[PDB]
Design a binder for these strands. Structure first.
Length: 234
DNA sequence: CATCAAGCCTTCCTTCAGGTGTTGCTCCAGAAAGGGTGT
């Protein structure tokens, strides 16, 4: 269907996971249903859901951005945007002279069509490592290429099934090249880290017409980009 | 190459002419007596 993208301009850049932790710390004392909505927690406990999370943080040059997938995620972002903006306004009016928080909002539709020619898509800061078995797959390129193939195809199928639209099942993807390999730490000052890929390029015969999220740690702000900017790039 | 804009208000009829003159029926609905004249 359609997804929603809300940008919060603050005047200074804060990272997606840091903004996630900041709105977790700030709105915690009051309104527990709303933070249970935005961090996609279980209705009874603090543990997040194992399914596809509808609302995820993203990257903004002057602040942070929020993505609500589908009608439910769009409604959650719609009921949560003024409370988040008021919390940011009070937090940054408590200290200093005080800044003005600007907003932006977009409703990007989702579409996909199969074409008989390959198409190029570059994904920045995608997490692909979670276990030791994937590390054993990563050492050899032949058994790692098929792993990236299946990961990209399953991420596309999971997002298409989560948003509620049908995807053709004859898609042939291919993975060409990589630029860098780095690490991602969920919590600062922790020994544990997950391997991640920087500037991967992929080739799929079909075309995409919106924000598409691939890989792991999608909620934290990893492995997503707009295909609308990348088709006809400029 | 994708959205975001994807109007808003208020006007939203007014007076007046809004008939005049005529026409506004006519006629006949019988049969015999007493003359001709034409066959």
């Amino acid at each position: 269907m359609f997804v929603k993208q809300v940008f919060f301009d603050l005047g200074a850049r804060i990272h997606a996971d840091e903004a996630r932790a900041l709105v977790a710390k700030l709105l915690d004392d009051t309104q527990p249903g709303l933070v249970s909505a935005l961090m996609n927690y279980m209705p009874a406990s603090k543990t997040s859901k194992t399914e596809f999370p509808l609302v995820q943080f993203s990257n903004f040059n002057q602040g942070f951005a929020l993505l609500g997938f589908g009608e439910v995620g769009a409604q959650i972002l719609s009921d949560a945007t003024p409370i988040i903006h008021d919390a940011m306004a009070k937090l940054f009016a408590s200290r200093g002279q005080g800044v003005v928080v600007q907003v932006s909002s977009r409703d990007v539709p989702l579409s996909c069509e199969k074409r008989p020619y390959g198409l190029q898509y570059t994904v920045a800061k995608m997490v692909v490592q979670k276990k030791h078995e994937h590390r054993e797959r990563l050492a050899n390129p032949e058994t790692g290429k098929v792993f990236l193939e299946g990961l990209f195809l399953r991420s596309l199928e999971r997002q298409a099934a989560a948003v509620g639209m049908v995807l053709p099942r004859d898609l042939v993807v291919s993975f060409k090249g990589a630029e860098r390999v780095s690490s991602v730490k969920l919590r600062p000052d922790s020994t544990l880290a997950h391997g991640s890929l920087r500037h991967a390029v992929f080739e799929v015969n079909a075309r995409l017409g919106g924000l598409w999220s691939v890989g792991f740690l999608l909620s934290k702000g990893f492995g997503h980009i707009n295909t609308d900017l990348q088709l006809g790039q400029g």
